[PDB]
């Protein structure tokens, strides 16, 4: 198999031939990806209801981990 970095072929962050990142793209998917770049560290990426901790981006990945 192949681990695609982009979920759809029109995504500018990947080559449509390969589904993998273009040179200069850090990411193509995720709550911590914007315009093919990782969002800044500590950007809030998940906001639960009520008085529960938000999660934040790490600056170095595209997911929104469990990071308060």
- Please name which of 67, 47, 48, 49 lies closest in space to residue 57, comparing C-alpha atoms: 67
Count CB neighbours of 56 within 10 A: 20
Q: Are 21 and 14 in contact (CB under 8 A)?
A: yes
Residue 55 forms beta bridges with which residues?
Answer: 46
Q: Which domains does the chain have, with CATH numbers?
A: 1-68 (4.10.70.10)
Q: Distance (Å, rounded) from C-alpha 41 to C-alpha 32? A: 9
Q: Are 31 and 18 in contact (CB under 8 A)?
A: no
Determination method here?
Answer: X-ray
Handedness of CA 57, 58, 60, 61 (dihedral sign): negative
Q: Are 22 and 15 in contact (CB under 8 A)?
A: yes
Dihedral of the CA atoms 5, 10, 11, 12 (nearest 10)? 120
Count CA atoms closer than 13 A to 32's CA, side-chain side: 22
């Amino acid at each position: 198999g192949k681990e695609c970095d982009c979920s759809s072929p029109e995504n500018p962050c990947c080559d449509a031939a390969t589904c993998k990142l273009r040179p200069g793209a850090q990411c193509g998917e995720g709550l911590c990806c914007e315009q093919c770049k990782f969002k800044k560290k500590r950007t809030i990426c998940r906001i639960p209801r009520g008085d529960m901790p938000d999660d934040r981006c790490t600056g170095q990945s595209a997911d929104c981990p469990r990071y308060h």
